[PDB]
Structures are given as C-alpha cells and as structure tokens.
C-alpha cells in the first residue's frame, strides 16, 4: 500500500519538484520531525543480531552521509531501521563544495555525490547528542545502537589528529565510531587506505579510544572504498587483523563508472551509490571476509533495496547491512520492505535466523 504510494507516485513527485539537495534536506526535516508512516512491521526474533558487543534489534541500518549532523536520529529508528550511523562528522564546522553536488541518475537507480565532507563540527554534533544522551542509551539498551562516522578537514595538515580528535569528543556518545578513509571527495583521503600511514593512523585511533572511560568506549570500525587494488585489501585485512579493529564497514561509493550507465549526469565528478555498486560491494565484502577468515564483523552497503540484495551481502560475510541511496527513489517504505522481504528469504533457504546466514557462502 504505502509502498507503492511512494515508489509510483509521491517520490516521482517530489524528485520532480525538488533538485536533490533540496530534497534531501527536506526529508532530514521531515524525519526529525517524526512526519513518517511509522512502520508497522514488528521486527521478529529472526532478524536480531549480536555483533560489535550489541544487540541489534534489526540488521537493517541508515548509512552515513543522510544524517550528517545527527539531527534526525530518533526519527530514523522510528522509520525502522535497526541501526543508525550519523556522519561524517568533521572537526571544524567546513561548508563542503560549491553548489550543485548532488545529482540524481534516475535511469540507473543511482545518485552521484561530492559533498565534501559538509559539516556542523564536532562541537554542535557533541551537544546535539548531549542532549539525547539517555534517551540513546535505553535504545542501545532495547537493540538499537548508535554509530558516529568521523571525517577529516580539509585543510587539515594531520589527519590522525583530526580523527583522535573526533574519538575524544564523540567517542563517548557512540556505540561504534567510523573512521572513514574512503570518501572520494577529499583530496588524498582515501590514500590513508595504504598500509604504512593505516597502520600509524588506526594505532593513534585506538590509542585514544581505549583512553576512553569502559562505559564510553565503542567499537572502532574502518569504512572502505570500493575502488581499492588486491593490494590495498590484502594489506587493510592484514592491520585490520594485527590492530584489532572491530570491524569493517564495505563500501563507500565508487570513483568508477560501470559500463552501461544511462543516465544524462553519468559523468559528473563524486562518488556513485545504489544500484551500479551493488554488486561491486558485494564482491568487496566476499574478498574481505575472506581475507580476514571471518573474524571480522562487516557491515555491508552499497545498491541494498531488497532482501535479496540484503541476503546476499549476508551470505557474501556482512553482519549487518546499510542503504542510503534506496531510500532516495523508495522513500521511507523501503526499510519494511527489505526487513520483510529478508526474513521471507531466511525462511524459504532454511536459516533459522540471521546470525545462520552470516557468511554462508562461503561454507
Ligand atoms: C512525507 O514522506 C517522507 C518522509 C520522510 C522522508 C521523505 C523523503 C525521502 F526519504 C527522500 C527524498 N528524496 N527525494 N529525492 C532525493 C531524496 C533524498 O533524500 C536524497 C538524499 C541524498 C541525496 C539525494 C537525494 C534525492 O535525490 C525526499 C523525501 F521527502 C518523505
Ligand atoms: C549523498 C550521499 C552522501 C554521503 N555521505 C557520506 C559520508 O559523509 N560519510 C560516509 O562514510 N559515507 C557517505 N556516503 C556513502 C554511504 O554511506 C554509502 O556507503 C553509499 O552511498 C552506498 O550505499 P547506498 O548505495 O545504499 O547509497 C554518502 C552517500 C551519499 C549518496
Ligand atoms: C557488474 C557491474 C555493472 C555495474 C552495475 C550494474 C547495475 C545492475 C542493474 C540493476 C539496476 C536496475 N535499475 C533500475 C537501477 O536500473
Ligand atoms: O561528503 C561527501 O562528499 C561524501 C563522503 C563519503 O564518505 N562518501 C561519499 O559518497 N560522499
């Protein structure tokens, strides 16, 4: 009912009237302020997972970059999803790039970004979680936990400052913290990828975060790029494993642009998500399960708008999975639809929950 509302008639509509930064802050408003269809869909006990030293009621999370400011946390859970991952958050508020950056390919089910690492700051993000700090922790509490992504300046001349200094300020509000080295819209960024300046990096990140007060102490986990060489994934696996990250978020948007691409804005500068990264995702998260012999919890995104593309970044090694870019072209009704449709899934290929399918293929 309300799925094919918003998918056949409101979401054309609104695409049609609003360009897509105006719309995505129309929808961050929209959500904060709980003007949702408050989903029906009860979460069964088959779709619950035990990761990241949480329970997560569903494995069904918002990604980064909706949510960049933590305005519209609690509106988020509301519209369903199990997780929510606020960010990237920067040090210092930064205004990202010239206007437009963002840019809609209806014909491919994908968006194109380069935002640039727009952010409130550190400091406004830390009192507008401040000011839900219990509220955060009875929903941690009930399997609904909290993850802050963290960003770098750009005119930042030591990144691992920037990203402990995001660990200090808001590694106490988090259930997980993101050290995102994969944006593709922050000059040499996603060069923190390679192992040398990884292994410095991620060290000083976990130096601080186990500075950290027991009960204010999350989970760290690396957000990787699509794009990288067997190279690259051969060496974050191998300090991945030697460091004792917690985990892995896989992918960020692709720099690429898969042959076929139909849409009119295909070859504008940015990050590509939905549908054309899908099954590059996927491949990443098969590849890194793999590498790290299933030790290491993933979180995977990229091109999810059912529970088939949910089940099958599962069974390829993730715990938990994100969608951002689905909800673009489906609007809030697609969070029921792909938690629906995976535990239909689960149940026609036997698994008895889940946690059953976690890496399946590979078995
Ligand atoms: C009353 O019903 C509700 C309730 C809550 C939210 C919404 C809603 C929504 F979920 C998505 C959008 N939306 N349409 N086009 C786009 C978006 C983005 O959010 C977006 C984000 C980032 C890049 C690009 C885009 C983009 O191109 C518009 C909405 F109103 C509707
Ligand atoms: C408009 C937009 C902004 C994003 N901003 C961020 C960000 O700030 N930090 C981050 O780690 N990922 C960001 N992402 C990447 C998403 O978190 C996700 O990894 C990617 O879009 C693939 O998922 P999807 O295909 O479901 O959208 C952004 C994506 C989009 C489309
Ligand atoms: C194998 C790499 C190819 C690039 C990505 C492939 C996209 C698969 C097409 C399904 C998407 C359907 N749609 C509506 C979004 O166009
Ligand atoms: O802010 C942005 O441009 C951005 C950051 C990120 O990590 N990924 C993405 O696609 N865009």
Do not use: C
Not at 23 to 33: I, K, P, Y
């Amino acid at each position: 009912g309300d799925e094919r509302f918003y998918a056949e008639h409101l979401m054309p509509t609104l695409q049609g009237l609003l360009d897509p930064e105006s719309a995505h802050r129309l929808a961050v408003r929209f959500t904060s302020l709980g003007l949702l269809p408050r989903a029906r869909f009860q979460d069964s006990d088959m779709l619950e997972v035990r990761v990241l030293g949480h329970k997560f009621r569903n494995p069904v999370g918002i990604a980064a970059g909706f949510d960049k400011h933590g305005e519209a946390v609690d509106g988020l859970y509301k519209m369903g999803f199990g997780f929510v991952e606020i960010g990237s958050v920067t040090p210092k508020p930064q205004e990202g790039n010239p206007r437009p950056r963002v840019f809609r390919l209806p014909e491919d089910q994908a968006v194109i970004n380069r935002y640039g690492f727009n952010s409130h700051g550190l400091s406004v993000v830390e009192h507008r979680l401040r000011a839900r700090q219990q509220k955060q922790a009875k929903l941690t509490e009930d399997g609904l936990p909290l993850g802050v992504n963290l960003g770098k300046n750009k005119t930042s001349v030591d990144a691992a400052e920037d990203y402990a200094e995001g660990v200090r300020v808001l590694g106490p509000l988090a259930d997980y913290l993101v050290v995102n080295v994969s944006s593709p819209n922050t000059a040499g960024l996603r060069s923190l990828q390679g192992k040398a300046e990884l292994r410095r990096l991620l060290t000083k990140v976990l130096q601080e975060r186990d500075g950290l007060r027991r009960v204010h102490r999350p989970a760290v986990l690396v957000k990787i790029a699509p794009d990288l060489t067997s190279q690259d994934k051969e060496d974050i696996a191998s300090v991945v494993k030697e460091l004792g990250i917690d985990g892995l978020i896989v992918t960020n948007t692709t720099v690429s642009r898969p042959a076929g691409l139909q849409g009119a804005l295909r070859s504008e500068t940015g990050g590509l998500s939905g549908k054309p990264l899908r099954d590059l995702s996927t491949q990443t998260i098969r590849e890194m399960y793999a590498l790290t012999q299933g030790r290491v919890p993933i979180i995977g995104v990229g091109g999810v708008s059912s529970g088939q593309d949910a089940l099958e970044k599962i069974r390829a090694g993730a715990s938990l999975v994100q969608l951002y870019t689905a909800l673009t072209f489906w609007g809030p009704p697609v969070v029921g639809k792909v938690k629906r449709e995976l535990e239909a899934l689960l149940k026609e290929q036997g698994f008895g929950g889940v946690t059953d399918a976690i890496g399946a293929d590979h078995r």
